[PDB]
RNA sequence: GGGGGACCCUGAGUACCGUCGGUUGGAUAUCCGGCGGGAAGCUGGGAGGCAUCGGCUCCCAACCCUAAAUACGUCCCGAG
RNA sequence: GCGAGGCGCAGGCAGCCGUCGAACCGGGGAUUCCCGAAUGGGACCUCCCGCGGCUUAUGCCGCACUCCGGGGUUUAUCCCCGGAGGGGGAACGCGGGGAAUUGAAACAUCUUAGUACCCGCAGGAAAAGAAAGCAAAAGCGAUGCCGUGAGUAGGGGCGACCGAAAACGGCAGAGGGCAAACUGAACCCCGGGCCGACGAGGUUCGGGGGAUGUGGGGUUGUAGGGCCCCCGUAUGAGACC
């Protein structure tokens, strides 16, 4: 964990980046039909793929 | 900026467009993250593209200059 | 560690003697290039001296050709190199074996061979 | 009968003529020319054919 | 011509000077690799009749294999007493496909054309396979062999397509007997051999 | 890396700017690919200044983020100012 | 393009036999493979569901290629 | 090509693009990071580390293994030139290896079954294909597929079960090339030149093959072909590029 290679720090790094809240400009273009993602993740509860 | 007007030049004139425009792209997206108040958020798709535009015909004349040696 | 075809030890001068008959016959008189020719020569019974080489793999090749000329009483001598035959020959590749069939200017010369080959083993 | 050769492609991608009535392979023009005529010249009066059972049936597709 | 001589000599090999030939040719070449690429052929007579010819694109590889049959591996489930066979059992292929297919895993970008028995030991079985090369210009220039540049001609050694993948799959028999081999050994249900 | 396509933007932080007030240091976000001489390189020739330092480090998000101290002779307040940052 | 010949050529560890294993409706008469033997070769050779002899009938292996009618649908049109 | 709007699913903010014809649509190009057959050499992390040429430098090219056709030398399989194979594909295809539950009301020959699965090899199809055949009053005349022959001949603790072909009626139809006899370099490939039109075709030079046979010829059964002899023919006809 302290001493991490480049690939696995980029990819959880495009995790990190992932886990968002859907905008709110989007959900009114959508009119409150787009709520939300599959991706988003609690770190101490859905564990990541890698 | 236009495809006619961007063969109208030669290639130094291309690169040292080439080379403005990279300049102010990063300008512009400094600024974007710095600024709240953008008059005009169309600025770097727009370089962007004249960029692309501008790659694309320095290469063809490029390949125009070869094809007339060859 | 000669083939098994051969029957005879040849002496180098007699081998070049051989040598310099087949460039005599090509440039002035007839001959055959090539095991094929040289087979359907002694079959017919024209051919007047038979020269084979050493260096034959496989010896199939020519294996056969010593008998036949016994059997059809037409003498036969080796020579070291096909390629050096082929070239006496004329051609620009090696050739197995070589008939003469009008000694042409090397009459004699075909004469002393056959009578020395028949004196050494025949 | 038309004995226009038909354009095939090698595993490299060269061009290869092919007969339509034998479906021989050739790269040389003149070798299938050559093949065409000498093997189907028959056809039009020019030879006749080879085998006793093909001899047969030709006579008795011709009458 | 010498052709009719080669193949009386090869007639019966014990019978002529190829007995002890042979004799001294299979101690040479015990000592050699299992598939090994030669320069001329030793049955001559044998390389014309299959189609090898004295020009660029054709090669020769002499291959050696083990006789006798094979022996099945250990089962490991449970077998009823008509599958626990081991020890007789024979190759649905013969050794001169095998041998085939070995010079072909040798030589990846050539293809095989035919082979021929060239001797065996007690032990050893050796043929002698003749390989075209597809890509040679000199071998595309030849109608008698351009054929087997064409795509759809590509691992016939492995397909079954040469002589002894013919004699294999039964293809020598036609009329009585030979019902439940054409069209292909699969298209008969995988039960005319 | 060739110059011009190796400077993404500009960092625009409040420790940006207190670097770039105290320490005589620029930083940007450049591209992950590029090293620190072909940084010092660029930022060389496009700026007509000379560099003294380089240090980069690769952010969580995946960015790379270089921090560039400049030579005494020159001043980061006036490349910031020619850039737009102040 | 047709007649005659008295000369030459027409594929070998192959066809085939015995035995063993597999396979098959193939049954003393399927096909494949291993082992031990193994020819004729144009004045020649093979097949005709036990083996041999005679007649008669059909054919020429042990080298190679070949479109169309067929099989499928990761795809498309159309339909129910 | 269409002809006034356009900026994906996706109804928002601000902007921008379009009459010099966009968006969209048919065709042709450019860019195309890293890993991946992955291929210069390595991977406990799709990231790292090199050697030779050119290049001022930026930067570009070459360098895996197993072979084929060639050249050079140091003869080390060492260097160079040209060319191949590798991996992927839903189902179908070709060639090999090959069970048991189950049925037989148990079970061993058998069945399940040449099945499931494994291994290898191709294509848009593949394989087969032109009789050392099928048939016997008569005869047919390559292969493949459909109907039927037929649950028949036949196999089988003759138990349970297994199981065709020929002929006949149809779709589609097409036949050719080697080895040898004979001749004997009259030959093929790569590169350059010249005529022709730039193509077909003709000719020439260098290199690589080739007398252990390139090319010409020949492909069949009461035989065919080679060679020899004899008569005739081409003045013509036809095919292909
Ligand atoms: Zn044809």
């Given at each position: ?38 991706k988003r993740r609690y770190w101490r509860r ?5 | ?70 | ?122 | ?47 006749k054919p080879k085998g006793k059972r093909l ?9 | ?193 | ?6 400077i993404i933007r500009p960092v625009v932080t ?73």
């Amino acid at each position: 964990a302290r001493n991490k290679p480049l690939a696995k720090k980029l990819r959880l790094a495009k995790a990190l980046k992932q886990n968002r809240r859907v905008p709110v400009w989007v959900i009114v273009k959508t009119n409150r039909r787009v709520l939300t993602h599959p991706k988003r993740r609690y770190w101490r509860r859905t564990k990541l793929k890698e | 900026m236009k495809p006619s007007e961007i063969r109208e030049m030669s290639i130094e004139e291309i690169d040292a467009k080439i080379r403005e425009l990279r300049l102010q792209l990063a300008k512009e997206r400094g600024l974007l993250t710095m600024g709240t108040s953008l008059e005009n958020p169309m600025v770097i798709r727009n370089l962007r593209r004249d960029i692309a535009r501008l790659l694309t015909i320095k290469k063809e004349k490029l390949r125009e200059r070869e094809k007339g040696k060859v | 560690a000669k083939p098994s075809y051969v029957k005879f030890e040849v002496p180098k001068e007699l081998a070049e003697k051989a040598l310099q008959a087949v460039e005599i016959a090509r440039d002035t008189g007839k001959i055959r290039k090539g095991t094929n020719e040289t087979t359907k020569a002694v079959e017919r019974g024209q051919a007047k001296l038979v020269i084979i080489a050493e260096d034959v793999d496989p010896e199939e090749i020519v294996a056969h050709l010593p008998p036949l000329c016994e059997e059809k009483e037409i003498p036969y001598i080796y020579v070291p190199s096909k390629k050096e035959l082929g070239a006496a020959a004329g051609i620009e590749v090696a050739a197995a074996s070589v008939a003469i069939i009008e000694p042409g200017k090397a009459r004699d010369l075909v004469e002393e061979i056959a009578m020395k080959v028949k004196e050494l083993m025949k | 009968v038309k004995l226009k050769a038909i354009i095939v492609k090698d595993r490299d991608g060269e061009e290869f003529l092919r007969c339509p009535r034998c479906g021989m392979v050739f790269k040389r023009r003149k070798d299938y020319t050559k093949h065409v005529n000498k093997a189907h010249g028959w056809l039009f009066g020019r030879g006749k054919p080879k085998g006793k059972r093909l001899q047969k049936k030709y006579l008795k597709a011709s009458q | 011509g010498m052709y009719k001589y080669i193949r009386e000599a090869w007639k019966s090999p014990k019978k002529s000077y190829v007995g002890e030939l042979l004799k001294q040719r299979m101690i040479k070449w015990r000592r050699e690799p299992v598939v090994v690429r030669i320069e001329r052929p030793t049955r001559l007579d044998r390389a014309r009749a299959l189609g090898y010819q004295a020009k660029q694109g054709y090669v020769i590889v002499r291959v050696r294999v083990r006789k006798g049959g094979r022996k099945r591996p250990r089962w490991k489930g449970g077998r009823k007493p008509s599958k626990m066979g081991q020890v007789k059992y024979s190759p649905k292929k013969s050794l001169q496909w095998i041998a085939e297919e070995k010079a072909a895993r040798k030589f990846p970008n050539l293809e095989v054309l035919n082979s021929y028995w060239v001797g065996e030991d007690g032990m050893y079985k050796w043929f002698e396979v003749i390989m075209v090369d597809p890509h040679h210009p000199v071998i595309k220039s030849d109608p008698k062999i351009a054929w087997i540049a064409l795509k759809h001609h590509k691992g016939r050694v492995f397909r079954g397509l040469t002589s002894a993948g013919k004699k294999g799959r039964g293809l020598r028999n036609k009329g009585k007997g030979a019902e439940k081999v054409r069209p292909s050994i699969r298209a008969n249900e995988g039960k005319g051999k | 890396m060739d110059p011009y396509k190796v400077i993404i933007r500009p960092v625009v932080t409040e420790k940006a700017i207190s670097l770039i007030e105290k320490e005589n240091k620029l930083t940007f976000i450049v591209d992950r690919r590029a090293t620190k001489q072909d940084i010092k390189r660029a930022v060389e020739e496009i700026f007509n200044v000379k560099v003294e330092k380089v240090n980069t480090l690769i952010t969580p998000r995946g960015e790379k983020k270089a921090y560039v101290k400049l030579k005494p002779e020159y001043s980061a307040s006036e490349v910031a100012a020619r850039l737009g940052l102040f």
